[PDB]
Design a protein around this motif. Structure first.
Motif, PDB file in Angstrom:
ATOM      1  N   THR A  77       0.813  -1.206   0.000  1.00  0.00           N
ATOM      2  CA  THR A  77       0.000   0.000   0.000  1.00  0.00           C
ATOM      3  C   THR A  77       0.849   1.260   0.000  1.00  0.00           C
ATOM      4  O   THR A  77       2.047   1.241   0.321  1.00  0.00           O
ATOM      5  N   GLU A  78       0.194   2.348  -0.369  1.00  0.00           N
ATOM      6  CA  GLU A  78       0.732   3.690  -0.269  1.00  0.00           C
ATOM      7  C   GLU A  78       1.183   3.963   1.170  1.00  0.00           C
ATOM      8  O   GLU A  78       2.222   4.584   1.421  1.00  0.00           O
ATOM      9  N   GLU A  79       0.390   3.469   2.112  1.00  0.00           N
ATOM     10  CA  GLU A  79       0.673   3.625   3.526  1.00  0.00           C
ATOM     11  C   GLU A  79       1.959   2.896   3.915  1.00  0.00           C
ATOM     12  O   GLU A  79       2.721   3.391   4.735  1.00  0.00           O
ATOM     13  N   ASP A  80       2.198   1.722   3.332  1.00  0.00           N
ATOM     14  CA  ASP A  80       3.436   0.983   3.590  1.00  0.00           C
ATOM     15  C   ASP A  80       4.647   1.779   3.147  1.00  0.00           C
ATOM     16  O   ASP A  80       5.642   1.857   3.863  1.00  0.00           O
ATOM     17  N   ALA A  83       5.218   4.820   5.465  1.00  0.00           N
ATOM     18  CA  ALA A  83       5.736   4.385   6.761  1.00  0.00           C
ATOM     19  C   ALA A  83       7.233   4.004   6.729  1.00  0.00           C
ATOM     20  O   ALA A  83       7.962   4.308   7.660  1.00  0.00           O
ATOM     21  N   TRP A 108       2.106   6.141  -7.084  1.00  0.00           N
ATOM     22  CA  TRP A 108       3.152   6.245  -6.056  1.00  0.00           C
ATOM     23  C   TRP A 108       4.387   6.969  -6.611  1.00  0.00           C
ATOM     24  O   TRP A 108       4.999   7.772  -5.926  1.00  0.00           O
TER      25      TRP A 108
END
Ligand SMILES: NC(=O)c1ncn([C@@H]2O[C@H](COP(=O)(O)O)[C@@H](O)[C@H]2O)c1/N=C/N[C@@H]1O[C@H](COP(=O)(O)O)[C@@H](O)[C@H]1O
Length: 229
Positions: A77-80, A83, A108
């Motif tokens: 994910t974008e979140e991964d 982070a 991304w």
């Protein structure tokens, strides 16, 4: 450049399963002490379970060296991505998701920029001579070639590609010549110091070296000296 690499499971250095200790940081620091300009980490825990991504360990490891670290392992994910960058990694390495959802990953590239992302492609040459991309060694080809996938990402600034042969010098000579605006990284196939000599002049920009360093076949320092000639 030489790119020394470690695979991590729950804080443990491993080779795929052989165990090499619970102390990855002194190893990375010595790799850097010998002249390495970039390090490579695979988070096998996180790849198996994104809830368990080893963000705290990675933060520590990155803080403990003075060179950029590229980190991958089941980034989905974008979140991964955000982070890992927030924890301080220099570049996020993306394999499976880049094959599976190219339009999403192109987004991304637009958000984070091409300097922050490495496209990792597992390649096997099929009976027809085509460089097929696969999402892993355990699964069939995806029906997209290396060339198709690389050319999908060029319009959003693709710069870094990590290419592993899972089916040889000829492969790298061919792709580096066809895309001179891309910096290719080779991965796998390094059994001794001569495999590194063999990659000199192919156009490969970076050589990822994992197991051979752990098994004591040569040092990072000797690998760099051969690479630079
Ligand atoms: N289970 C796995 O082994 C695995 N799963 C994913 N990866 C890599 O992670 C990256 C991201 O993959 P995704 O999880 O995003 O799909 C890709 O490069 C994959 O190849 C995996 N690669 C593991 N080890 C790598 O394989 C090569 C072995 O070198 P060597 O020691 O000198 O002989 C080096 O690149 C090592 O870092």
């Amino acid at each position: 450049m030489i790119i020394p690499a470690l695979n991590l499971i729950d804080g443990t250095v491993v080779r795929l399963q052989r165990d090499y200790g619970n102390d990855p940081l002194p190893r990375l620091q010595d790799y850097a002490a010998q002249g390495a300009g970039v390090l490579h980490l695979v988070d096998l825990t996180g790849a198996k379970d994104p809830a368990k991504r080893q963000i705290p360990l990675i933060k520590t490891l990155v803080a403990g060296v003075n060179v950029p670290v590229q980190v991958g392992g089941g980034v989905r994910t974008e979140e991964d991505v955000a982070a890992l960058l927030k924890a301080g990694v220099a570049r996020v390495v993306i394999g499976s998701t880049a094959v599976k959802s190219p339009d999403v990953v192109k987004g991304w590239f637009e958000r984070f920029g091409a300097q922050a992302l490495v496209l990792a492609l597992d390649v096997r040459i099929d009976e027809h001579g085509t460089k097929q991309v696969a999402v892993s060694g355990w699964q069939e080809n995806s029906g997209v070639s290396l060339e198709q996938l690389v050319e999908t990402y060029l319009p959003v600034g693709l710069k870094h590609v990590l290419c592993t042969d899972i089916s040889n010098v000829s492969l790298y000579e061919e792709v580096c010549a066809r895309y001179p605006q891309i910096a290719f990284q080779s991965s796998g196939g390094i059994g001794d110091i001569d495999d590194i000599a063999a990659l000199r002049g192919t156009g490969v920009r970076g050589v990822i070296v994992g197991r051979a360093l752990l098994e004591g076949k040569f040092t990072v320092k000797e690998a760099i000296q051969c690479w630079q000639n």
